[PDB]
């Protein structure tokens, strides 16, 4: 039994950084044969780095990798907002997995508000006796974001369903969905509907609001 | 440039089979080591299978007996039929020139496999039409297993999209889309919600118009 572990499992960094994560084996492992895969947000992943210390064909002066023995890092001398990725080491003679459980790197940016838009449900979908109010929150940061739902003045927590991308690697940025699912009836015994966007050092929530009679 | 397709992704039934294919391009197929490596939900890479380029076989321990990694240097496909399917088999497949040793130079982008005794359900998709920038909504409500592919326009406005994973409610997925296009080119011009889920074998388009 020989494992890989990589540390940190999770990090944040901002551009400019140098960042370095590690992988270690239980018993010696060959350098020649210690590899690193990237992988990005809903991307399959590519080979990195090989034989411990060689960058692939396309990867950026910035990486690096060193170690021997049961010992090896990934490096990156000034991490880009592209870094944004999973980085995975791997050897062959590492069993039950060949893999390591991967370093999830995230990439820090100043704060950012998101574009916050507001949907009534469909009105087709409204025949099928479910009423889905939907809320977009996209582009901010950082990724600790607060929706509120309001009926009417009154805040609503129940049928409310969140979803967050993973980091953009383009901007640094998430973005959310919050949807608030009712019957068709208790939608209609209302008219004022409210998405509130709010994070812990905001002064001001932003608000997206829609009245079932006028539009 | 090296391309690799793979194809073949479905649910099935445990205990069922399924044939993966992997189609190569822009090298000499013959010359190379060709593996699969899969990820499952909890994003944890696996090993599965690799070939070297005179046919000898390895395979993980978790696959043995079941799986059979196959190629044909002649059509430059690399295969892999997976019998007694388990619940566990669940993940996104990726075919890979070369193997563990050297490494793995080249992935595909995948094919998804889902292992469950669940019956397909397809999805319902719902236009989400507003109440100089204009973000329009998807609604792809009800179904199961994953993956569904959401586009828009077929493709062409890839720029200000976002697709949000799909959330798990009474044994089924909803997930919403946001697009977001200058206000002079809608609803100018046509922008339509385009749903693909092959597990019903099922695709939907789905346009956008004016009204709440």
């Known amino acids: 039994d020989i494992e890989l572990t990589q540390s940190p499992a999770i990090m944040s960094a901002s551009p400019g950084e140098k960042v370095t994560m590690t992988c270690r084996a239980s018993?010696?492992?060959?350098?020649?044969?210690l590899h690193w895969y990237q992988q990005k947000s809903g991307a399959s992943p590519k080979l990195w780095i090989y034989?411990?210390?060689n960058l692939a064909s396309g990867v950026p002066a910035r990486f690096s990798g060193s170690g021997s023995g049961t010992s090896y890092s990934l490096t990156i001398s000034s991490v880009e907002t592209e870094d944004a990725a999973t980085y995975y080491c791997?050897?062959?003679?590492?069993?039950?997995?060949?893999f390591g459980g991967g370093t999830k790197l995230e990439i820090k940016r100043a704060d950012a508000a998101p574009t916050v838009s507001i949907f009534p449900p469909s009105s087709e979908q409204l025949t099928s006796g479910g009423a889905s109010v939907v809320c977009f929150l996209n582009n901010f940061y950082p990724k600790d974001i607060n929706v509120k739902w309001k009926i009417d003045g009154s805040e609503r927590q129940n049928g409310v369903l969140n979803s967050w991308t993973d980091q953009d690697s383009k901007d640094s940025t998430y973005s959310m969905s919050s949807t608030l699912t009712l019957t068709k009836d208790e939608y209609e015994r209302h008219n004022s509907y409210t998405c509130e966007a709010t994070h812990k050092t905001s002064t001001s929530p932003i608000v997206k609001s829609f009245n079932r009679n006028e539009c | 440039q090296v391309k690799l397709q793979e194809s073949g992704g479905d649910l099935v039934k445990p205990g069922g089979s399924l044939k993966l294919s992997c189609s190569a391009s822009?090298?000499?197929?013959?010359?190379?080591?060709m593996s699969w490596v899969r990820q499952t939900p909890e994003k944890r890479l696996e090993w599965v299978a690799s070939?070297?380029?005179?046919?000898?076989?390895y395979y993980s321990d978790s696959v043995k007996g079941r799986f059979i990694i196959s190629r044909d240097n002649a059509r430059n496909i690399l295969s892999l039929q997976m019998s007694s399917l388990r619940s566990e088999d669940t993940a996104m497949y990726y075919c890979?020139?070369?193997?563990?040793?050297?490494?793995?130079?080249?992935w595909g982008q995948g094919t998804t496999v889902t292992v469950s005794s669940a019956k397909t359900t397809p999805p319902s998709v719902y236009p989400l039409a507003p109440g100089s920038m204009v973000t329009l909504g998807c609604l792809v409500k009800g179904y199961f297993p994953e993956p569904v592919t959401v586009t828009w326009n077929s493709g062409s406005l890839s720029s200000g999209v976002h697709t949000f994973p799909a959330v798990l409610q009474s044994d089924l997925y909803t997930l919403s889309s946001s697009v977001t296009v200058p206000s002079s080119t809608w609803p100018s011009e046509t922008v339509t919600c385009n749903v693909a889920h092959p597990a019903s074998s099922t695709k939907v388009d789905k346009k956008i118009v004016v009204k709440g």
């Open positions: 034989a411990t210390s």
């Open positions: 791997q050897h062959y003679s590492a069993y039950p997995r060949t």
């Open positions: 890979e020139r070369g193997e563990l040793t050297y490494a793995m130079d080249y």
């Open positions: 070939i070297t380029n005179g046919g000898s076989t």
């Open positions: 822009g090298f000499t197929f013959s010359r190379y080591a």
């Open positions: 018993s010696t492992v060959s350098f020649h044969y």
